[PDB]
Design a protein around this nucleic acid. Structure first.
Lengths: 173, 46
RNA sequence: GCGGAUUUAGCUCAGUUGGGAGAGCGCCAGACUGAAGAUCUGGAGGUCCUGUGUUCGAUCCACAGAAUUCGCACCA
RNA sequence: UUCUAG
RNA sequence: GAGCCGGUAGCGGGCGUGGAUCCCUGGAUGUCCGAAUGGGGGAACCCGGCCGGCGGGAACGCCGGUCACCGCGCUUUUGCGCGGGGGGAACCUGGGGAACUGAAACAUCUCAGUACCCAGAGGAGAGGAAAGAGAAAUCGACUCCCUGAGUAGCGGCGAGCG
RNA sequence: GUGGUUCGUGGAGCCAUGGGGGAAUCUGGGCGGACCACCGCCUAAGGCUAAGUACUCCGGGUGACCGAUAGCGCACCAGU
RNA sequence: GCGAGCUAGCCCUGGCCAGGGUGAAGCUGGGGUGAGACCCAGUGGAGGCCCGAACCGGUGGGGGAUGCAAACCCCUCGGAU
RNA sequence: GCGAAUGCCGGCAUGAGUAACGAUAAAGAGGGUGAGAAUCCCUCUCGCCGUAAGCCCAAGGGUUCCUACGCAAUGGUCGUCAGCGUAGGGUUAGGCGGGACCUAAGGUGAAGCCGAAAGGCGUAGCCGAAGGGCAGCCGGUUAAUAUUCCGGCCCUUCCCGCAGGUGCGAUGGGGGGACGCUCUAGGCUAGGGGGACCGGAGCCAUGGACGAGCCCGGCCAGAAGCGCAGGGUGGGAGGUAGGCAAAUCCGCCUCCCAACAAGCUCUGCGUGGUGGGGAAGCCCGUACGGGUGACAACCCCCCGAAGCCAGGGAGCCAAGAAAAGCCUCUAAGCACAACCUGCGGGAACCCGUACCGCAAACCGACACAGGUGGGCGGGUGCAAGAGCACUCAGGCGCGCGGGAGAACCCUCGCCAAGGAACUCUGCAAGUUGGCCCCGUAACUUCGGGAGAAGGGGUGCUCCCUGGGGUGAUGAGCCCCGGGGAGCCGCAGUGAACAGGCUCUGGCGACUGUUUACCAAAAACACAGCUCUCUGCGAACUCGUAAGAGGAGGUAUAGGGAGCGACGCUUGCCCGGUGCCGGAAGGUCAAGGGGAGGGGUGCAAGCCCCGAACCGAAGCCCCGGUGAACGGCGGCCGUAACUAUAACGGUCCUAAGGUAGCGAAAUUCCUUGUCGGGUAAGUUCCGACCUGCACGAAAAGCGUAACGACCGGAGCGCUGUCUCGGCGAGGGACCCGGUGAAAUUGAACUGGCCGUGAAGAUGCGGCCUACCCGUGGCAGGACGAAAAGACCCCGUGGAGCUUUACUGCAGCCUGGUGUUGGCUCUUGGUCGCGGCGCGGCUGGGGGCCUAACCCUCGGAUGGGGGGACAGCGCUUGGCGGGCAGUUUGACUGGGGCG
């Protein structure tokens, strides 16, 4: 419903309980309200799995318990993640419903290796974080916009195209 | 038929009105232009 | 009707001191083989378009003409 | 590599 | 110096040589807008603290005065007391700054440092006692008029600029 | 690397500066047009300075200047 | 310098589509197999979906040409959550 | 010193007493006033609305509104009429709307951030609305106002007092107001309908009936008290590793009461009690009638919302805005005086109202059949419905009236007999048009093509029968069959609104969207594919540097793109070009860096030219590259009794068209040749296929459904046509009233055959030839419109294009700067193939790091990067993205030549 919310933990020792299935319409991410100890909440990432009955978190410590997330430092090798913590705390550093996250495919000193979900590879840094678990996007692909144009229903630009025009109009155009 | 005249108090006013002109460099300009220059009254005055 | 190029021993093609002419694939004779063929052995052969001009001498340098392939024939 | 029918 | 309540000549009423109309200059009022500046805003409207009479408050309580924008100095203390800003036909320097058109094209060039826009000083700014000019060991502030001179000279050495 | 200057890249200086190096306090330090010797001038890298020239909104004067389609367009409940 | 009370857009915020028709996901029940696939029947009510007013339009013909009008009148037509 | 510039300005004639009265929703009659009335006032027939030609709220316009006088001009005629003139007068609110309250976009904007200056952005706070919020309603009352004035009924906020009560006491917090769409239960006013059931004013004329007969109405609003009706939340303790920066609030975990319980916000009764109440109505206009007095009446059943309770419930996906009130509390003061309550007195503003308002008062310059946003929109009939025909309330007759009825244009109605042959074309029109039943083909992505195609039904009468709302159900109402019998007309959706269908082909799939005043299409758009730049502080787009956008997106993503469902399938070539990679080698800018020469120099010196070598991208050179640009051979021979071909011979190219298709909208020789369709068919449609010049990605062959697309054919049907011929309404014509307009030197303007500058009323010869007019018919006056758009000419202009010229924007790039340390290293060089050293100086590899930047993540500290780079200066390069010029003459037309 035209809004944002959470995207980056950094208060820990906190109790992570899988709020609920609030599959969400606004970023290809499907998240559920994450119930913290105090009671303070957050429509959190959609890293598939972690059943309703919440039951997680993270921590400077550890707990690969699927989903969840800590610094690079605190992370296995051969592991699949998201909550792409690029720079030191820059919260998320990639993978948006981009299921196929990154896989600490080898780390090095204040530098941890990452399979570039998108489609390449290089390294991050020290404390830098990132929570494993999948994504959530049920292949959020495909699906037919049949005899109409989902598009429009887009609210998402018919910013339509052209290219053939009659003129000689717009940038590199 | 829809000409182009339908005036809109709110509108026309707003849009044009002592102020504005003022607020502006330009506006201001001509304005004090008109002023002397011509005499008369002015927009909003309208 | 105009502009470019081409008309060489059966066929596709090469040659700007021009002064003395070939290449690959045909055609006849001799070998290999019981036999043809492919393949090794030698030769026979042309107005370098028709008719002229400059020049010692040019078909390769030049001016007309027939036949050849291609372009041009668009504006109202 | 090929070389008709009786 | 003896007539007047403006252009209105008209009705109805009136001031005046114990110096009216009007001519001057210095006044006190100067409602609302406009830099506006207390606050808001489609100008000429609608909103707020302090003082204020106290005011009809017939046995019941309000306008008026006021006040305060913000950038400037700095007696800094908790900052109290001075300047500004908005104008303005034309003219002035700085800041920025163009094609036409000429060259019988047009890229150099010209129109020009013009036209315009901007800022800002003034009643005038501009500028102004020389590391200047030139060469007779000569001259001397800056400015402006004539002259020097359409010369010395700049240049697709062309139009021109000069 | 641009300016202004008569100088449009030129034998091309002075003064002014966009970037980078970054001297001297009187035998110092620019200058008289590449530069160099000698001569001659001047003394910077802060500031103020009325008067002599420019301009008419304003007021006056004067006209081989006009007369209501001329003059400012507008001689009077016109920049309406 | 002047303009989106022209028009093309885009942001914000309300209003508006008379009636009717077609009948997919589903859920209920029944159906030979292990469960099912899957069938059928009921319910059900989607779709830039159909038939059509207002409303949005303005092909196809008619008039009009110093018009009613610097684009309009007439018959006709498309769209119609 | 002026005809004279389609000259400017002013007047003035033309056509011309012809053309027009702004919708073909018509009028006509009697009286009245007046100088004078088709055009005013009263009255009586008549026509048009009626979803409007209704009242209403707005926005816009602002006295246009009323009343008494008046018509000079505006009223396209009059005119005593006016939305025209002068004069006077009219619109009042604690509760309606705007503010004294709130914010999103957006705009402003102290601080902050960047510009040559003007300026740009912009936090918080503020501006900003029919979005949020907020305390009333019905009747009366003037010439006009009214939810404001009357009155009857219903309230709210602030203040002072006292009475009672309780930790009151910020806006900081928390809930909180808060919402999408499509759909639907339960209940109820609005609204409608039957009542012969109640009240009352008169009737019946006519044949008939005084009868459940005709005609009016039988309602509107309300303290709470009160039962149908829902509508929103649960209730205690404790822990509060403690949040929502600070504690009791709410958020989160644990144990008990965890209902149809109790809770708190709209409709019915009602009913306090008020009003209205028509038909009156004795005084009174018995008539511009009604102002105001009987009595009224005051009731039942029926239908029932597309938004009344309500923030419903159910489904769905594209998954639905922020600040007053309520409770928690710090600062803080009350805490015998702070807030809640009760009663009594006291206070309540600023500006808005008239009338118009699907419009002569609003935009179109005009009383112009143009547009302009919301509210039920009365009924009867038709399956329903703001569609339709008639009409209710209220509105109006278009502001020019008579009179003839000729041609002729308009709009409309009809036909035999034929029934498209008319013609480019069934363009038009006419067929057909509504609901029910029966019945439905090729093809299909099985949804559809079906309303397909093709029939048949419908009216009013009586009979017996079955259903769902009807509080049981018993004058009441509805959906409905049923089946039987029967009546009438040419006809029985009787009128009115209402598909012609089919057979085929081509393109584009489809609903679309678009060139406002020609073109709605095969044009774009697409859902869908493929290459593809991009790792964030993205890449591209605006920007002078900030900055926004991007995106609080993050490779199932964001931008660049050529096609444009789906199906089937996209082959061959990287020699040139763009690009991606390479960077060893050539080149080459600024620059370092020295041989050497030169000028002056008595001399130390003092200026230049300077070159060997080191030196950047770029370009050259190697490769990779096609849903990147682009391109994808020629002729001679041969079984072929005749023809490419199965094969063979070759010269050039980067290979040298593949699968599908084919005279297609790419095929001019052509109406190509064969076939079908026909009385013949240069359109079609099938097939060949020597494809003048298809072809896979600006796709290629096909493709259900789909189209106001285009073309081809058949039935059905009709004046489209064989000529039509009749008619109805409207101008045109005659009358009265009004009364333009472009063009025009001027003119009393005949035909001829000849002529002239070669298409003459005006010149020659001749022949007909009285003067004027009106209703017409087009030929000539080279008629009107417009100093040709087609043309060329001006070394005119303006837009797009690429290997045109140049230059800039941006981008890449060497050295240089605020860009600091530490170490690992190889190269040059001159000196003393060499090695040792030496100054020189060049390359480069590293965490760091103190600039710089960024970073943040809750503070100024940490973190990341870091000598980058941003960024400044010079270098060089790409560079049509843009800016400015240019691209000759001849020419027996411009060009090509």
């Amino acid at each position: 419903q035209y809004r944002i919310i959470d995207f980056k933990r950094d208060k820990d020792g906190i109790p992570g309980r899988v709020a609920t299935i609030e599959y969400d319409p606004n970023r290809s991410a499907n998240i559920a309200l994450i119930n913290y100890a105090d009671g303070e909440k957050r429509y959190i990432i959609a890293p598939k799995n972690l059943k309703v009955g919440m039951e997680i978190m993270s921590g400077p410590d550890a707990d690969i318990k699927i989903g969840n997330a800590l610094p690079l430092e605190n992370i296995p090798v051969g592991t699949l993640v998201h909550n792409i913590e690029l720079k030191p705390g820059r919260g998320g550093q990639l993978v948006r419903a981009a299921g196929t996250s990154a896989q600490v495919l080898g780390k090095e000193g204040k530098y941890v290796i990452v399979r570039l979900a998108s489609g390449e590879v290089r390294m991050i840094l020290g404390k830098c974080r990132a929570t494993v678990g999948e994504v959530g996007n049920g292949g959020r692909t495909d699906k037919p916009f049949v005899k109409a144009g989902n598009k429009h229903h887009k609210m998402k630009a018919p910013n339509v195209r052209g290219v053939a025009m009659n003129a000689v109009d717009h940038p590199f155009g | 038929m829809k000409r182009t005249y339908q005036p809109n108090n709110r509108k026309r006013a707003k849009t044009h009105g002592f102020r504005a002109r003022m607020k502006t460099k330009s506006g201001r300009n001509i304005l004090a232009r008109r002023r002397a220059k011509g005499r008369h009254q002015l927009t909003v005055s309208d």
